[PDB]
């Protein structure tokens, strides 16, 4: 009898509301513009699959349409908040050595996990052998940088697609958003933009966890009486 | 290639006990001797007789407990005593084990003219130190 009401009133309650966690408050187009999110690489480095998200080139410098970025970021933050609310494992991945410390620190602070080092072969496709069969794979992977240091797509994207793990991702003008479940077109090299992404994701995850705790406490209190 | 008393790895599945796993160069390093008697010490005598007795005891005990032995014997000698310590699987009913213990003790005592004790430690199965 406990499950029949617990499952509904906790798990399925946020799924009815469009924005349960009010992630739209966190960011604004003005804020993204101030964080230099719209900047992209030169037209030569452009990846064709990123053409729909490119507003236009400013003197052979692609500008990322922040109108589309706002909607994509809304979807991605809402998805991340819902996954955190369901206590799913969230793994940040970014091989960019500049932000490795910041990303690891943010992941540790928000209670989620980070992998900013050399992604060993089969860390996901061979996780059962590398960790023991009882290991629990991440339920959501967030790429703050979808390219490795040789500018090829991160192998973790393909591996997560193989293991059916949804991927939130910051795709730049030269990135490949084909297999990323929730692409977020935006600048991934500017320190301001990366800091903005880290703040937004940390805030969404923390809000989701706090809301989960509050809802669990309220449901347990009301069920007793 | 050295072949003495070594268990060569074949597939990674064959189980071996602690003694079978260790090679001869590990004797007195990681595994003790299976027979303890003052014969081989400095100045002592009758080493050959003790060695023959030990070989016969091992053969007799292996042939007297068919498949019961789970490991090599340990032949301790204190004075004229002779303790045979063995590790045996829990296959036979204890009646047969007790019958064999009494039999072997009496027969060996009358055959070697020394009080022979037989101490059995039972194990559910052959202890596996590793797989080769």
């Amino acid at each position: 009898e406990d499950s029949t009401d617990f499952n509904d009133k906790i798990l399925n309650e946020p799924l009815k509301h469009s924005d349960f966690f009010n992630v739209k408050e966190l960011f604004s187009v003005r804020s993204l513009f101030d964080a230099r999110v719209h900047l992209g690489h030169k037209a030569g480095c452009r990846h064709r699959f990123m053409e729909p998200y490119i507003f236009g080139s400013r003197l052979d410098h692609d500008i990322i349409d922040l109108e589309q970025t706002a909607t994509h970021l809304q979807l991605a933050l809402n998805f991340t908040a819902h996954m955190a609310y369901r206590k799913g494992i969230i793994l940040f991945i970014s091989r960019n050595r500049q932000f490795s410390y910041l990303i690891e620190n943010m992941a540790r602070d928000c209670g989620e996990y980070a992998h900013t080092r050399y992604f060993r072969g089969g860390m996901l496709t061979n996780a059962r052998l590398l960790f023991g069969p009882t290991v629990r794979l991440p339920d959501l992977i967030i790429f703050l940088h979808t390219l490795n240091n040789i500018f090829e797509p991160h192998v973790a994207v393909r591996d997560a697609a193989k293991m059916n793990i949804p991927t939130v991702g910051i795709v730049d003008t030269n990135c490949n958003p084909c297999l990323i479940t929730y692409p977020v077109p935006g600048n991934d090299d500017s320190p301001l933009a990366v800091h903005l992404y880290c703040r937004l994701f940390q805030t969404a995850i923390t809000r989701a966890k706090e809301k989960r705790q509050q809802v669990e406490a309220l449901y347990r209190l009301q069920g007793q009486k | 290639k050295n072949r003495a008393a070594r268990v060569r790895v074949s597939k990674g599945d064959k189980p071996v006990t602690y003694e079978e796993a260790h090679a001869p160069h590990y004797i007195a390093h990681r595994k003790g001797w299976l027979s303890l008697h003052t014969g081989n010490l400095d100045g002592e005598d009758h080493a050959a007789e003790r060695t023959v007795e030990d070989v016969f005891l091992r053969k007799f005990m292996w042939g007297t407990f068919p498949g019961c032995l789970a490991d090599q014997l340990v032949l301790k000698r204190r004075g004229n005593q002779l303790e045979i310590c063995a590790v045996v699987l829990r296959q036979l009913s204890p009646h047969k084990y007790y019958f064999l213990v009494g039999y072997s003790e009496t027969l060996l005592s009358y055959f070697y003219k020394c009080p022979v004790r037989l101490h059995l430690q039972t194990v559910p199965s052959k202890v596996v130190y590793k797989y080769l």
């Binding site: - | 070989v55 016969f56 068919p66 009646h95």
Partner: protein
């Protein structure tokens, strides 16, 4: 000499010659060969030629509430006991010799079509008793290595399917055939496609695709038509759960190319519901057996279009010469429509 005797294990190791260069190479033919036997299969402790009955070892220690004494069986009963032991050993050997046959594949000496049972269960409550495994080809690939020269290995292509639209295939390379089977099926169970089936018995529409150099032309067929397809396609369709279908394979008949092209074509097919959603129109089925009654098999879930689809008098499609020749009856063939076993 007693001290010169050895143990049973050492004697078997020496006599059987299980190891050594002869086993590795096999230059010396061993049709006249020895096999291992358990000398202690039925031996009872306390039984011997003299036929003695030792209380507590081979006869009950207490009989009628009293301890038995050392007794020796008579010569007649001891002879009977020895004969009974011999007969029991013979019966054990006879039971060992007997066995049960299996079902051959496509041909009596081909691995194709032979079932391998369900894939091995997963680590944590992940079992696949619903799945069946079938071999599509086994090949002895010989690789030239620097030291050993020609080295034999087995490459096996298997397909696994539960019969309910979920199926996949995989390749397995090994040194032993059974290891290849295990690898291939345990990997194929992770690469499962989902083949949408019309009415759970056939494909949704006619398919014609070329993979590399292999052309596969599959035709949707009504119930009871059976599987008239290449034997590999028959096996894969049974694994998927397709009962009625036609299929002609042209070009190279490479088994792997054929298999993965078949899976590609089956996976990429479009359902009636998808078609209705795409074009926003009712998908109306017309059956000759049902007369002019229009049967709606799929309706768009969104808005329904009001403008009728343009009715071109001449459709612009690429027909097949084989299909046209068959329809016109000029496709004379002494091999087409030959009566064949049930599929």
């Amino acid at each position: 000499s007693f001290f010169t005797k050895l143990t049973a294990d050492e004697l078997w190791k020496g006599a059987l010659a299980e190891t050594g260069a002869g086993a590795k190479k096999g230059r010396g033919k061993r049709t006249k060969k020895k096999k291992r036997k358990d000398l202690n299969r039925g031996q009872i402790i306390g039984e011997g030629r003299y036929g003695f009955l030792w209380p507590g070892l081979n006869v009950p220690l207490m009989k009628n509430g009293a301890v038995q004494t050392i007794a020796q069986r008579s010569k007649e009963e001891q002879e009977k006991v020895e004969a009974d032991m011999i007969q029991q050993r013979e019966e054990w050997d006879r039971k060992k010799k007997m066995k049960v046959k299996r079902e051959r594949g496509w041909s009596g000496n081909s691995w194709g079509g032979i079932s391998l049972g369900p894939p091995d269960p997963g680590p944590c409550g992940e079992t696949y008793e619903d799945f069946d495994t079938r071999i599509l080809e086994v090949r002895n690939v010989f690789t030239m290595t620097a030291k050993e020269g020609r080295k034999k290995s087995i490459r096996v292509l298997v397909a696994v399917g539960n019969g309910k639209g979920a199926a996949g295939f995989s390749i397995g390379k090994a040194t032993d055939r059974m290891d290849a089977f295990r690898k291939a099926k345990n990997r194929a169970v992770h690469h499962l496609h989902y083949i949408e089936r019309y009415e759970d018995h056939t494909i949704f529409h006619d398919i014609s695709l070329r993979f590399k150099r292999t052309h596969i032309k599959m035709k949707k067929q009504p119930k009871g038509y059976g599987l008239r397809c290449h034997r590999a396609i028959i096996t894969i369709c049974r694994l998927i759960g397709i009962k009625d279908m036609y299929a002609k394979v042209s070009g190279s008949i490479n088994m792997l190319s054929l298999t993965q092209g078949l899976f590609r074509g089956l996976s990429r097919q479009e359902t009636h519901q998808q078609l209705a959603d795409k074009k926003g129109l009712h998908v109306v089925e017309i059956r000759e057996e049902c007369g002019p009654l229009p049967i709606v098999v799929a309706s768009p879930r969104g808005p329904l279009r009001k403008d009728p689809e343009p009715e071109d008098e001449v459709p612009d499609v690429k027909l097949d010469w084989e299909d046209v020749k068959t329809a016109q009856g000029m496709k004379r063939s002494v091999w087409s429509n030959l009566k064949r076993a049930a599929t």
